[PDB]
Design a protein around this ligand. Sequence first.
Ligand SMILES: Nc1ncnc2c1ncn2[C@@H]1O[C@H](COP(=O)(O)OP(=O)(O)O)[C@@H](O)[C@H]1O
Length: 280
Amino acid sequence: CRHFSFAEIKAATKNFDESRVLGVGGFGKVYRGEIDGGTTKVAIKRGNPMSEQGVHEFQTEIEMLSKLRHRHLVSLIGYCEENCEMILVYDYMAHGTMREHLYKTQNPSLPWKQRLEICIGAARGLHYLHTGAKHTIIHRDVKTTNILLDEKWVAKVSDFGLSKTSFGYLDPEYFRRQQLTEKSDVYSFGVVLFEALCARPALNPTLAKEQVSLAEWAPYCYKKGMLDQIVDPYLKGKITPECFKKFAETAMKCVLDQGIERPSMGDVLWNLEFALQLQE
Ligand SMILES: Nc1ncnc2c1ncn2[C@@H]1O[C@H](COP(=O)(O)OP(=O)(O)O)[C@@H](O)[C@H]1O
């Protein structure tokens, strides 16, 4: 993992010019830049050392990503703790977050098979975190803004500041059992799956009481046989009956009340690949 000068960070971002800002996260501003003389596109996150939750996330993202390698995980090229700063350098994901392609957006809608393949890609990332590191990693922050898309539309998991060895995605059993297991990532992923299908936020505080949380609302409509009515309008008529059923029953199991009843990510990943095959 590469240490960067604070001078290279300025060279890459052209001294943090707002022409290169990509957005704002809970950590700071995210800048697009180039390093190694313009062969490498990157994204650079500037955090604030005054905040020690920011300090905690900066060090956690470094100690996690520096030892992980997976096609479906955002890669951390390097960092900069110079002059008591806090900077992280990732590879640039040219197509932003998954949420920017589902709703509240001007981007075109994604075809069903591309959505399915994005969820499969993210499930592979999560499966690696749970079974491929030295110990289980619990991401704790699985959501549609933390799934990024590169120039070939490969889905990649990011945002490791809260991981250990958001509202609407929170494992409700965590506020009861007060323990945390990788099944909490499965809960959050099941919500991602429903967002991909319904193209609406996980929490929409303005709706009728039963519709506020996608996690409780989508299962409810499936049992009542009206899940087809809240499906993304672009997707209506584009999912074969058997894919629709395997997909929805996979998402329903992910958001069960009790973590012990939920599938593992290996199981989820397998059932999504099965769904893709039933679609074709
Ligand atoms: N590696 C990246 N490549 C491209 N754009 C990125 C990358 N990381 C973050 N972004 C952009 O920066 C924005 C801020 O994301 P992030 O800093 O993770 O904050 P949060 O996860 O709290 O929304 C994202 O919405 C996205 O547009």
